[PDB]
Amino acid sequence: VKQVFNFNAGPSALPKPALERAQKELLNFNDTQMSVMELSHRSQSYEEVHEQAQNLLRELLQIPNDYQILFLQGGASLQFTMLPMNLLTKGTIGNYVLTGSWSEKALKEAKLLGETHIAASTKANSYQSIPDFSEFQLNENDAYLHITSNNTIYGTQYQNFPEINHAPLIADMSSDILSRPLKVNQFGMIYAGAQKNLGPSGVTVVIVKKDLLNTKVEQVPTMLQYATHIKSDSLYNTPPTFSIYMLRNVLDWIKDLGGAEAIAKQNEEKAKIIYDTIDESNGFYVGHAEKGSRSLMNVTFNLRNEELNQQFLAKAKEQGFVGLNGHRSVGGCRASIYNAVPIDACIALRELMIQFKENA
Amino acid sequence: KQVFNFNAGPSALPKPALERAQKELLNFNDTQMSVMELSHRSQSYEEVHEQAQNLLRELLQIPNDYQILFLQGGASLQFTMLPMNLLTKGTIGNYVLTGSWSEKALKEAKLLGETHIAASTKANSYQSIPDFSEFQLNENDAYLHITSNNTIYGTQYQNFPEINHAPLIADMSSDILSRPLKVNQFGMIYAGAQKNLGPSGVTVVIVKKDLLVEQVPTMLQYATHIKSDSLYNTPPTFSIYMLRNVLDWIKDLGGAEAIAKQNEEKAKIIYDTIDESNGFYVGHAEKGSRSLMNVTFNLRNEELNQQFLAKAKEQGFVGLNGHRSVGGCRASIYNAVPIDACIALRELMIQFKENA
Ligand SMILES: *Cc1c(COP(=O)(O)O)cnc(C)c1O
Numbered sequence: 001v002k003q004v005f006n007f008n009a010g011p012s013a014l015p016k017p018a019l020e021r022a023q024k025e026l027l028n029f030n031d032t033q034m035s036v037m038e039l040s041h042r043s044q045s046y047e048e049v050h051e052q053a054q055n056l057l058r059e060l061l062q063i064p065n066d067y068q069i070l071f072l073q074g075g076a077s078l079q080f081t082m083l084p085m086n087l088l089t090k091g092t093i094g095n096y097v098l099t100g101s102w103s104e105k106a107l108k109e110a111k112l113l114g115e116t117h118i119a120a121s122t123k124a125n126s127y128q129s130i131p132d133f134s135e136f137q138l139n140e141n142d143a144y145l146h147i148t149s150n151n152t153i154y155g156t157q158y159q160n161f162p163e164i165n166h167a168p169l170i171a172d173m174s175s176d177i178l179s180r181p182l183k184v185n186q187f188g189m190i191y192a193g194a195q196k197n198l199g200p201s202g203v204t205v206v207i208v209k210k211d212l213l214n215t216k217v218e219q220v221p222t223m224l225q226y227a228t229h230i231k232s233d234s235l236y237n238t239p240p241t242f243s244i245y246m247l248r249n250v251l252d253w254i255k256d257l258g259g260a261e262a263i264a265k266q267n268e269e270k271a272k273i274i275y276d277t278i279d280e281s282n283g284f285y286v287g288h289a290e291k292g293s294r295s296l297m298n299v300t301f302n303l304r305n306e307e308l309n310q311q312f313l314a315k316a317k318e319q320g321f322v323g324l325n326g327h328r329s330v331g332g333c334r335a336s337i338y339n340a341v342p343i344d345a346c347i348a349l350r351e352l353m354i355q356f357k358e359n360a
Numbered sequence: 361k362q363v364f365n366f367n368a369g370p371s372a373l374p375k376p377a378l379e380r381a382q383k384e385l386l387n388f389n390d391t392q393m394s395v396m397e398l399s400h401r402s403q404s405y406e407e408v409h410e411q412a413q414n415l416l417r418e419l420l421q422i423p424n425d426y427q428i429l430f431l432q433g434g435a436s437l438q439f440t441m442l443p444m445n446l447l448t449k450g451t452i453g454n455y456v457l458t459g460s461w462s463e464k465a466l467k468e469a470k471l472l473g474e475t476h477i478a479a480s481t482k483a484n485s486y487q488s489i490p491d492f493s494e495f496q497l498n499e500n501d502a503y504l505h506i507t508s509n510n511t512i513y514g515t516q517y518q519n520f521p522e523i524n525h526a527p528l529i530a531d532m533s534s535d536i537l538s539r540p541l542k543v544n545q546f547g548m549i550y551a552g553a554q555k556n557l558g559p560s561g562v563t564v565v566i567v568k569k570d571l572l573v574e575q576v577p578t579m580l581q582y583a584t585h586i587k588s589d590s591l592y593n594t595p596p597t598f599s600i601y602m603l604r605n606v607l608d609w610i611k612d613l614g615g616a617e618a619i620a621k622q623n624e625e626k627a628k629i630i631y632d633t634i635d636e637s638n639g640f641y642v643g644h645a646e647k648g649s650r651s652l653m654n655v656t657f658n659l660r661n662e663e664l665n666q667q668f669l670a671k672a673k674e675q676g677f678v679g680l681n682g683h684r685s686v687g688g689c690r691a692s693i694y695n696a697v698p699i700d701a702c703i704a705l706r707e708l709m710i711q712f713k714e715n716a
């Protein structure tokens with residue numbers, strides 16, 4: 001039929017082959033004559049999937065052997081409280097770097113549970129940049145330092161990560177995990193809801209340094225202890241089997257295209273198509289982020305006034321574009337260009353943007 | 361290529377629901393996207409989300425003063441979320457123990473507050489549901505918690521107690537919407553979807569609104585989810601889509617009374633087989649407490665047990681091994697397990713008995 005261009009911000013576009021693969025075997029997976037959705041998570045067919053998703057992640061991000069990969073329910077939002085519940089012990093501080101709204105939501109949950117600090121923040125200037133690491137106020141009794149690698153709503157992104165040796169570095173990488181190579185040993189823990197760049201909603205990937213968190217925390221509910229899930233290899237209770245399966249399929253696709261290094265090349269190219277369009281628009285489109293902090297995953301911009309914003313977005317929607325409205329809290333536009341968004345969608349958006357501009 | 365899916369969780373699903381999912385997996389509702397590729401704030405998703413709630417409301421006849429929540433974390437997270445929200449200081453989390461899942465719920469409550477055992481059949485290895493007249497209740501109970509169907513032991517409440525001093529709370533993971541319910545008997549009902557309602561990944565929580573909070577993490581307050589209609593953060597959108605599909609199938613076959621007729625016939629096939637076997641097969645549950653959802657039984661010794669389960673597997677039956685904690689055999693016959701599978705099981709049981 002007509003064209004559809006999927007710029008949704010979360011859940012988001014999946015790579016077609018992962019979906020075609022799921023569709024073909026939806027009723028009979030691995031010759032069992034059952035859907036993967038109908039299997040015991042103790043079945044060898046399921047365990048193969050569970051283990052393969054872990055091994056693909058390990059290989060793709062080169063995760064060290066002293067790290068474990070968890071598949072948890074509850075979204076990144078649940079990690080906002082689980083993290084301080086496990087690590088923010090009395091006399092210690094949950095130190096946060098604020099670079100957008102998701103950083104503020106993380107902070108808020110730690111505030112419920114312990115002493116918090118703000119290491120650095122760009123909130124005053126509306127989160128248009130990542131602060132300089134030299135501005136980080138660190139504390140000797142920090143339980144961890146928490147960052148948001150990609151600020152989904154504001155369109156900014158860490159170009160690199162701080163060297164932290166006094167506390168574990170923790171990162172919410174929900175909207176840019178496995179969009180590029182990563183030095184995992186810079187971190188104590190990384191977490192990401194899968195639905196932005198790794199597959200479906202319903203599972204959350206948590207990469208954890210085993211010895212930071214494989215120990216029982218007195219007074220913490222069993223399901224909310226990392227230890228529980230580490231010990232049981234994320235099979236303590238019933239996992240989200242179809243979500244993990246789809247995550248596997250998406251990881252296979254990333255591997256098939258050349259891994260993190262190759263997908264970064266693709267992601268830089270797609271992003272360049274949109275940012276050049278903005279930058280050659282003589283101010284008709286204005287990007288929110290400062291240039292040194294531009295996200296490769298979420299491109300945020302405004303037209304010169306709200307009327308033009310609305311006309312632009314209405315025209316896009318009429319032309320088949322999905323998900324371009326900015327987050328409700330900030331307005332404007334947001335082109336989400338995660339791994340699986342195809343480059344011809346980006347080209348299409350550029351065409352839209354140039355004709356709207358020329359015809360305005 | 362014969363396969364009979366007696367898996368205990370996750371479990372068989374209705375073929376029409378899976379076929380419908382397959383057909384539109386790449387192009388949901390003419391959007392040219394998978395349901396999996398939609399924003400949860402899209403109208404496209406929001407209609408599915410609401411349709412799943414509406415079908416449960418219709419099928420269980422849930423009154424307006426109850427809200428239906430779709431949460432992540434399984435029934436296991438509910439074990440702690442419930443006392444986290446309702447087990448206030450100076451109140452008691454009161455539990456009726458009718459199996460190991462009862463035990464797991466009570467354990468989580470003991471972390472957070474005072475607990476109590478209203479009644480228990482543990483001493484007799486959970487062969488039955490206790491008589492309601494035996495319950496020991498307290499003025500300051502925060503709730504009374506029961507497990508409606510004891511998945512590992514094969515027993516099930518025939519009816520529910522009339523409790524007015526405190527909300528009645530029920531873990532209905534393995535029998536929700538397998539029969540009509542009087543939802544007004546309860547302050548809260550919860551169930552992982554993965555036995556009777558859908559695939560794993562979503563938990564259905566039916567809660568008396570006015571029933572349910574300083575210092576509880578945002579994600580762990582029922583009020584968060586009630587207030588946001590289970591759209592506070594990203595829900596498990598494909599699992600809720602599949603839940604909708606399963607609910608459409610239940611509606612299409614005639615609803616909760618119709619599925620109960622099917623389920624009672626399925627259980628009748630297996631229990632009759634056991635009762636007519638002259639002690640060759642022995643059911644664990646007392647007759648009066650027999651589950652319609654999980655049929656537990658053993659052969660006369662461990663070696664016959666093992667020979668049977670081996671023969672079953674060779675013949676295409678999946679999931680019949682009993683829980684590791686109790687051994688024996690367990691035939692899980694949740695909603696989507698077809699009558700033909702139970703007939704096949706019967707015929708295998710009879711042939712095995714003849715050939716021993
Ligand atoms: C989407 C988002 C979240 C929220 O994840 P849920 O799975 O919806 O809890 C948290 N952090 C970031 C950076 C996000 O982009």
Ligand SMILES: *Cc1c(COP(=O)(O)O)cnc(C)c1O
Binds near residue numbers: 433437461509511
């Ligand atoms: C399966 C089951 C559970 C566990 O559910 P999860 O989703 O695995 O947490 C809890 N209670 C009962 C009665 C069950 O049958």
Ligand SMILES: [Cl-]
Binds near residue numbers: 101103154
């Ligand atoms: Cl943000």
Ligand SMILES: [Cl-]
Binds near residue numbers: 009152
């Ligand atoms: Cl977002």
Ligand SMILES: [Cl-]
Binds near residue numbers: 509512
């Ligand atoms: Cl049980």
Ligand SMILES: [Cl-]
Binds near residue numbers: 368512
């Ligand atoms: Cl069980």
Ligand SMILES: [Mg+2]
Binds near residue numbers: 255
């Ligand atoms: Mg490959």
Ligand SMILES: [Mg+2]
Binds near residue numbers: 342
């Ligand atoms: Mg194309």
Ligand SMILES: [Mg+2]
Binds near residue numbers: 608611612
């Ligand atoms: Mg219908």
Ligand SMILES: [Mg+2]
Binds near residue numbers: 632
């Ligand atoms: Mg008879």
